[PDB]
């Protein structure tokens, strides 16, 4: 329901 | 009409004091639906609105895990801005990220976004293309070179026009009592003097859904924008909102003021009077 | 670092009528950071059972929360929402106005 990331 | 999904997380550092503060919300529109809080006793994604609670324990279990990596995520982010920006290990630094789907009248695809934000300002965004990157400084510049080269875009874009729409179109239906209503705003106007030579003239609208509204007073038709105290529409705790908006004129002058009200569950926009 | 005052409303769900339970409600909403201390007051008093609303945030990032409880105005009760934050150099106590 919510997304599969870091900056 | 027309409807939105939005994810919200929220990330504190809280340093020497153990871990984040992670906090994550859902909402359908104006309506919140799931919770999550790092710190809470549960450690489980939680029901806010009553037509969520029908979903099973997959649902449950599966958010629950995808919630906690969304938490992992920005625990490594607050290390990372911290580097990007030679922040002392002192200080408490807070990232945001948002992200979601709009759909139309029709309930098909219109929009998706997400946005991340560091120390309250724009840190990066994903532009309306879904094919690339707003970034709002120089270390943000890094994090775009870094998810070009990953492919981030890509796997944005694949949830966004699918899983997104798929799963706010389910809600829309099973909450449809809840999300597929427009409660009218009821008005009314009131006077108080201040003085023997000024009055207050509040413009009220009350038990709306959903939030959006807008509020205006016009003298002889004309706006008095800078002259109205326009304060945030807030929740009556009931899942309807309220707002006003207020000036002060001249005793006597009171029949001169209108109050303009417009909002997608009035069949027109009203004009409230004081004759 | 960005800092954003909170904006703070004091009000009843329901127009208030002596002696009929209603629900009190302290909106606290524009701040940044998201670190605030909010207490609902009766005459000059904390109240013990306070609820609040999960964290969330408008489109320009500032935060808001609903603080709230259940109670029946009377006559003579004073109502207040008592706010501190790093923006504010004392906290701000904002009486409940049953008559705007």
Redesign the interface.
Known sequence: X??X??? | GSHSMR?FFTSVSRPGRGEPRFIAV?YVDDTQF?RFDSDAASQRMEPRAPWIEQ?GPE?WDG?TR??KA?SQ?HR??LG??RG?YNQSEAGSHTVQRM?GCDVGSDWRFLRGYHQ?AYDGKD??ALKEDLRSWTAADMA?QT?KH??EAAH?AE??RA?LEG?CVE?LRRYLENGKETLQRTDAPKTHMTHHAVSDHEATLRCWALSFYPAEITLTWQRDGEDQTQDTELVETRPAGDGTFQKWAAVVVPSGQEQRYTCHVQHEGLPKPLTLRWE | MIQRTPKIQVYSRHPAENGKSNFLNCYVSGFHPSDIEVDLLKNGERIEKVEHSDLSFSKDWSFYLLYYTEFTPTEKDEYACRVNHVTLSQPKIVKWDRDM
């Open positions: 919510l997304a990331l870091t900056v | 994810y859902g799931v979903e649902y958010e995808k919630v969304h995520t490594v982010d990372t801005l990007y992200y991340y840190y990066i943000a994090t870094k998810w981030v796997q944005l949830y899983t799963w």
